[PDB]
Design an enzyme around this catalytic site. Structure first.
Site, short mmCIF file in Angstrom:
data_model
loop_
_atom_site.label_atom_id
_atom_site.label_comp_id
_atom_site.label_asym_id
_atom_site.label_seq_id
_atom_site.Cartn_x
_atom_site.Cartn_y
_atom_site.Cartn_z
N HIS A 86 0.84 -1.18 0.00
CA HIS A 86 0.00 0.00 0.00
C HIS A 86 0.89 1.24 0.00
O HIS A 86 2.07 1.16 0.29
CB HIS A 86 -0.88 0.04 1.26
CG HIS A 86 -1.84 -1.10 1.38
ND1 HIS A 86 -2.98 -1.20 0.60
CD2 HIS A 86 -1.77 -2.20 2.15
CE1 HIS A 86 -3.58 -2.32 0.94
NE2 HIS A 86 -2.86 -2.95 1.88
N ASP A 89 -1.22 8.81 -1.52
CA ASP A 89 -1.19 9.95 -2.44
C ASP A 89 -2.11 11.01 -1.84
O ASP A 89 -3.31 10.80 -1.67
CB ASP A 89 -1.73 9.53 -3.81
CG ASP A 89 -2.05 10.54 -4.93
OD1 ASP A 89 -2.02 11.77 -4.67
OD2 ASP A 89 -2.32 10.10 -6.11
N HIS A 91 -3.72 14.57 -2.54
CA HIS A 91 -3.98 15.59 -3.56
C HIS A 91 -3.59 16.99 -3.14
O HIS A 91 -3.52 17.90 -3.96
CB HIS A 91 -5.45 15.59 -3.98
CG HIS A 91 -5.88 14.41 -4.78
ND1 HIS A 91 -7.14 14.37 -5.36
CD2 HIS A 91 -5.29 13.25 -5.14
CE1 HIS A 91 -7.24 13.22 -6.02
NE2 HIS A 91 -6.13 12.48 -5.94
N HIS A 126 -5.55 9.07 -1.01
CA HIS A 126 -5.92 7.69 -1.29
C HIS A 126 -4.69 6.85 -1.55
O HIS A 126 -3.63 7.37 -1.88
CB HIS A 126 -6.90 7.61 -2.48
CG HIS A 126 -6.38 8.09 -3.79
ND1 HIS A 126 -5.61 7.32 -4.63
CD2 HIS A 126 -6.55 9.28 -4.42
CE1 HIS A 126 -5.34 8.03 -5.74
NE2 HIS A 126 -5.85 9.25 -5.62
N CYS A 127 -4.85 5.53 -1.47
CA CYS A 127 -3.81 4.59 -1.87
C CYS A 127 -3.74 4.56 -3.39
O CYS A 127 -4.75 4.72 -4.08
CB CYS A 127 -4.16 3.23 -1.27
SG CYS A 127 -2.88 1.98 -1.49
N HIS A 137 -7.72 -0.52 -5.02
CA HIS A 137 -7.51 -0.16 -3.62
C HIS A 137 -8.42 0.99 -3.21
O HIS A 137 -8.95 1.01 -2.11
CB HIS A 137 -6.05 0.19 -3.32
CG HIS A 137 -5.16 -0.97 -3.26
ND1 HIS A 137 -4.30 -1.21 -2.20
CD2 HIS A 137 -5.01 -2.03 -4.10
CE1 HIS A 137 -3.68 -2.34 -2.43
NE2 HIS A 137 -4.08 -2.87 -3.56
N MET A 142 -9.81 2.65 0.37
CA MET A 142 -8.58 3.30 0.80
C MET A 142 -8.51 4.73 0.31
O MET A 142 -7.75 5.11 -0.58
CB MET A 142 -7.35 2.56 0.31
CG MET A 142 -7.19 1.23 0.92
SD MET A 142 -5.55 0.49 0.95
CE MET A 142 -4.65 1.48 2.13
N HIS A 247 -26.95 17.08 -1.55
CA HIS A 247 -28.16 17.86 -1.34
C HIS A 247 -28.61 17.63 0.10
O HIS A 247 -28.69 16.49 0.54
CB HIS A 247 -29.27 17.44 -2.31
CG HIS A 247 -30.57 18.11 -2.05
ND1 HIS A 247 -30.91 19.27 -2.63
CD2 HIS A 247 -31.63 17.80 -1.36
CE1 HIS A 247 -32.07 19.69 -2.22
NE2 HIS A 247 -32.55 18.81 -1.47
N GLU A 271 -29.01 24.61 -4.07
CA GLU A 271 -29.86 23.49 -3.72
C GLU A 271 -29.09 22.19 -3.68
O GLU A 271 -29.22 21.41 -2.75
CB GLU A 271 -31.08 23.37 -4.65
CG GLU A 271 -30.83 22.98 -6.11
CD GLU A 271 -32.05 23.10 -7.03
OE1 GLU A 271 -33.10 22.49 -6.72
OE2 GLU A 271 -31.91 23.73 -8.11
N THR A 272 -28.27 21.96 -4.72
CA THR A 272 -27.51 20.74 -4.91
C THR A 272 -26.18 21.17 -5.49
O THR A 272 -26.10 22.10 -6.29
CB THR A 272 -28.25 19.83 -5.90
OG1 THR A 272 -29.54 19.54 -5.32
CG2 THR A 272 -27.50 18.56 -6.22
N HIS A 298 -28.06 13.37 -4.90
CA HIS A 298 -29.35 13.57 -5.53
C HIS A 298 -29.46 12.86 -6.87
O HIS A 298 -30.26 13.27 -7.71
CB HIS A 298 -29.77 15.03 -5.56
CG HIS A 298 -31.25 15.21 -5.47
ND1 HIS A 298 -32.14 14.82 -6.44
CD2 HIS A 298 -31.97 15.80 -4.49
CE1 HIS A 298 -33.38 15.18 -6.03
NE2 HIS A 298 -33.32 15.76 -4.84
CU LIG Z 1 -3.74 0.11 -0.74
CU LIG Z 2 -5.93 10.78 -6.88
CU LIG Z 3 -34.90 16.62 -3.94
#
Ligand SMILES: [Cu+2]
Ligand SMILES: [Cu+2]
Ligand SMILES: [Cu+2]
Ligand SMILES: OC[C@H]1O[C@H](O)[C@H](O)[C@@H](O)[C@@H]1O
Ligand SMILES: OC[C@H]1O[C@H](O)[C@H](O)[C@@H](O)[C@@H]1O
Ligand SMILES: OC[C@H]1O[C@H](O)[C@H](O)[C@@H](O)[C@@H]1O
Ligand SMILES: OC[C@H]1O[C@](O)(CO)[C@@H](O)[C@@H]1O
Ligand SMILES: OC[C@H]1O[C@](O)(CO)[C@@H](O)[C@@H]1O
Ligand SMILES: OC[C@H]1O[C@](O)(CO)[C@@H](O)[C@@H]1O
Ligand SMILES: [Cu+2]
Ligand SMILES: [Cu+2]
Ligand SMILES: [Cu+2]
Lengths: 333, 333, 333
Positions: A86, A89, A91, A126-127, A137, A142, A247, A271-272, A298
């Site tokens: 494993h 990473d 971001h 994430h892995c 993964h 992960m 939402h 709203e969303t 939603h």
């Molecule tokens: Cu992993």
């Molecule tokens: Cu990524």
């Molecule tokens: Cu709705």
């Protein structure tokens, strides 16, 4: 690097470790530990099982919170009780595939990565071990998020501070559980045994389950999210692999960073909103009415039928100006 | 609440009931009636049928238009000729699951809900009776939109008014019609009889049809949208369950609120915009050229093959400066 | 129209023909030629073939670059060695279905279209012959992009110029290759022979392959994208039919126009952005660290398993302040 060191005790989602919004601290080295756990878990009320792979035992991984200019020093631990290599990473980080190229560890190993928090916002981690293992993964669980706050806290882009009373982290997980011939979900003895069937399903791009906090109903009942009328709540939402459209049923996004990055002003009165796969976003809402709210993606099929519904239980006084039942259900004249 | 009352006569989409943009009126109680109709309809040129459930007989439900600070008082009617309970959730409203928790009515009942229009923009409304019924009622057609205008009308975020000459409401509907063994679309005697097969299909997340105004070709031919060169047209687009990416073929979105909320400035000069499932958005365009335009979702498979194409027929003078055929088709030298 | 004429020599993606950012030139007629080529190509490392249809022999078609107020005069050529009619629709253009209604040409014909570049940004162009042929020609590869720069070059919305050191064009292609009964990809003798099976698959909305620059691995190895630490790179990304979510692994989007239109200020500091199907967007990043980066759509299944990964190879000095491996992998104490 001769800066002060500060340890953080991570807490399981949807809660978030204690932190300051605006701070008078200068840059520090903020120390975190993540211990990987591969484990078979139950993901629905029917008892469907799932070969999960996790940071710190949870889906999502815990939310890490720092401020712009901090250095984030993570000890990543892959105990010998796991079966696979494993890595991690971030971001939020710059270089080496987000850290992935510096953190590949076999079972029985650990590694220590430091990255400077030069970009503000909420970000996925994430892995990503390489090749076809990357999606596998991630969709096995992960993934988590990190929040990098401005030192002056959040603002509305118009000069005004936005202070939250509480923050929750909702990690959404697309899951791919294969079915047998008669249509029942399959169970597997190991992640390795699940891989062939699971990859075949993954490539068809349709999840069997879409859940918050690792399971259908995780953020309901005893474990509903809570607030009071008058409280400003920040909801961080991440999705490491697939789009989502959050939402708040009965509410709004008062201030929303749907791309999740605090160098940009929030949008207002949504709203969303939309969380692009591979990202985190954040929405703030000040509750105005008591009662039950549902927080969903939603695509309502995903929300009601595949698992992607949380609840808020909100205390306080009902506001009849904002909404009222003028006439209760009655026979049509 | 001692405010003036004003009745609105709703009109079927894509048209919109008469309203003011900027207004000198103060807040009012604006009265609307929606009568639910379950009915079997034809959705394509092949004669495929569909168990629809509708507000006011249409897909989408009609557009309701008010101004910020108005109170919206809706009489929702579920005649005894229907078979199922229904309710209404307004994304524009605050509290009680958007009104859904105060409006559940059996066949033979009606209810009256009032909500204060505190958020500007275009918003979805939809049925949401509880649990797995929520997505089913929505994708069966029980969704529309409401527009809450600023009292000063729309603006560009730079101090300038944006006045539309006409507004159209395009409601996009993802539909899930099952097939039999030999591959023909199935027909059902009731919504209840359609439910098991329809839910099984819904959970696989791929619609059989994606339509505007309830049917393939609804907004073509006699029923094409119209404009003249020089006219500024507002196009409200909603999708209550699934993402869409509107595009005016041969035109642009001059001013676009893709998240649909007028507290935010519009974006300018778009080719294609994005309506997140569970939302409405709006785009304004001033037509510069006559002729046929297509208005589509720019998944072109959905547009051309699953139903999601409207036309505009535009009158006026061709502008050779903007575009010209320098040389008509001819044999290659 | 008595303006100066300027010829452009187009170059194959991901490269972009030489152009000025800020310019002192006034409007010109900028002349381009696109020659359509239908051809069977290989799209993966397994040797899967594909009935492609292309502008200028490439997927995507080449990037055309002009400035606001230029007139774009395109000679579209459909040699007699092709089998089908074709045309071109420019999302940058106003009228006649983007030009499509003025450019339909049979094999053996050519046509000359001129359009005025009144909208700035990056825009899709694609074939659109009518009806069900529209999606088929697009997903067979008949799409590219045009960039319309402000005459003063790009800016950050805060008064400051943004100058790129180099630009790359990444065209993403969803492909629909049917399988036989035993599960192998099918091969066809002509686009016409591929049509029935390919349309049946298209309507189910799940691609078999998602590639950059026409093939799995096209932008890797010898053909990796390149940069140096300190260089500002503009990455134009288009997708004519289906959404994408670009992400630079190990980097960021410093300045991003995800809807792709330069009348709008860029967003800053993104992790992942969103290209709506039927659009182009653009992101700028100044590289800070050397090494390998992956540029992906952040549906990681698509990226790692269906083809959608490019690499950058970046030269320069490692910055230990931004990131460092504090402790290499070691046995857990
Ligand atoms: Cu992993
Ligand atoms: Cu990524
Ligand atoms: Cu709705
Ligand atoms: O927080 C990012 C930026 O937000 C806004 C403020 O005007 C600016 O001073 C601040 O740097
Ligand atoms: O319409 C919402 C806002 O739009 C802009 C105006 O500057 C502001 O006065 C107005 O309140
Ligand atoms: O480039 C589009 C616009 O960008 C910004 C500038 O303030 C404005 O002058 C310019 O016209
Ligand atoms: O909230 C972030 C935004 O607020 C400002 O600092 C002030 O408007 C902008 O420069 C920034 O984009
Ligand atoms: O159009 C809405 C936008 O316009 C303004 O009122 C003026 O720039 C902003 O405060 C608002 O976000
Ligand atoms: O970068 C484009 C943006 O920059 C400005 O010219 C100055 O803020 C805006 O008017 C425009 O939207
Ligand atoms: Cu209903
Ligand atoms: Cu073509
Ligand atoms: Cu198009």
């Amino acid at each position: 690097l001769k800066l002060p060191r500060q340890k953080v005790e991570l807490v399981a989602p949807p809660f978030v470790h204690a932190h300051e919004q605006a701070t008078k601290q200068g840059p520090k080295i903020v120390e975190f530990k993540l211990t990987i756990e591969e484990k078979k878990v139950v993901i629905d009320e029917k008892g469907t099982t799932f070969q999960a792979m996790t940071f710190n035992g949870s889906m999502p991984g815990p939310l890490m919170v720092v401020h712009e200019g901090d250095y984030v020093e993570t000890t990543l631990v892959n105990p010998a009780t796991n079966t696979m290599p494993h890595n991690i990473d971030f971001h939020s980080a710059t270089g080496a595939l987000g850290g992935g190229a510096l953190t590949l560890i076999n079972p029985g190993e650990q590694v220590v990565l430091r990255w400077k928090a030069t970009k503000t916002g909420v970000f996925v981690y994430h892995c990503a071990p390489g090749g076809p293992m990357i999606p596998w993964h991630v969709v096995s669980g992960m993934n988590g998020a990190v929040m990098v706050l401005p030192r002056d806290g959040l603002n509305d882009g118009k000069g005004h501070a936005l202070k939250y009373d509480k923050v929750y982290y909702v990690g959404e997980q697309d899951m791919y559980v294969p079915r047998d011939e008669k249509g029942n979900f399959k169970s597997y003895d190991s992640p390795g045994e699940a891989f062939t069937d699971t990859e075949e399903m993954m490539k068809k791009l349709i999840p069997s389950h879409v859940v918050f906090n690792g399971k259908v109903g995780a953020l309901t009942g005893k474990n509903a999210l809570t607030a009071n009328v008058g409280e400003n709540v920040l909801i961080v939402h991440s999705q490491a692999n697939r789009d989502s459209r959050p939402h708040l049923i009965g509410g709004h996004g008062d201030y929303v960073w749907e791309t999740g990055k605090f160098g940009n002003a929030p949008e207002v009165g949504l709203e969303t909103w939309f969380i692009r796969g591979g990202s985190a976003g954040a929405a703030m809402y000040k509750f105005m009415q008591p009662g039950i709210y549902a927080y969903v993606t939603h695509n309502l099929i995903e929300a009601a039928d595949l698992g992607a519904t949380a609840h808020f239980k909100v205390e306080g006084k009902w506001n009849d100006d904002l909404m009222t039942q003028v006439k209760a259900p009655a026979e049509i004249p």
